[PDB]
């Protein structure tokens, strides 16, 4: 229970991010985050960058292709009015970096989920910087309940679902162009 679980690509789906948001207990914002791994290439966990938000879990430190990764999160404990933004980066094996953004505000009056996916050129950690660029800059995808495919370029394309709520999953997959 120190890293979040890998299990086999094909498991991953909305029952199992649905248990993992349920092991966090009743707390106002979370994020059961998924990442299915078919890119053919190996990741290592590089960091996770929280803008706002906490986990009680590191990143699964290996994920082979066909193996998906668990991760979660949820808002900073106690009465601050926030949600749970933050960035995943994995090194992979061609030594380029995939990036994943997901944004859950605290409030739906006026914010939305946001995700986003992109490969870096080269070994490059999640910070703020990166944030920025996967938020305000490259074109990231509503929670809306919809799937939303993209190209990613490096012989790779990503395929991934959010749902609009304040108790978030985020399911993606990281397949061969």
């Known amino acids: 229970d120190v890293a979040g679980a890998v299990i086999d690509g094909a498991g991953l789906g909305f029952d199992v991010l649905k248990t993992v948001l349920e092991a966090l207990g009743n707390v106002k914002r ?7 791994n078919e890119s053919g290439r190996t990741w290592t966990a590089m960091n996770t960058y ?3 938000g906490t986990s009680d879990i590191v990143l699964p430190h290996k994920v082979a292709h066909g193996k998906a990764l ?7 404990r106690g009465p601050v009015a926030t949600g749970v933004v933050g960035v995943i980066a994995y090194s992979m094996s061609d030594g380029n970096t995939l990036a994943v953004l997901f944004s859950v505000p605290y409030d739906y009056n006026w914010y939305s989920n ?9 070994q490059k950690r999640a910070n703020q910087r990166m944030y920025e660029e ?14 939303h495919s993209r190209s990613l370029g490096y012989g790779l394309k ?3 679902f959010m749902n609009s709520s304040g108790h978030a999953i985020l399911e993606i997959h990281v397949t061969k162009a």
């Open 158 to 160: 990503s395929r991934g």
């Open 50 to 52: 929280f803008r706002s």
């Open 70 to 76: 668990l991760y979660n999160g949820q808002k900073n």
């Open 134 to 147: 996967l938020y305000y800059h490259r074109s990231p995808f509503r929670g809306d309940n919809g799937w």
């Open 30 to 36: 979370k994020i059961a985050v998924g990442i299915d």
């Open 114 to 122: 946001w995700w986003n996916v992109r490969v870096y050129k080269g």
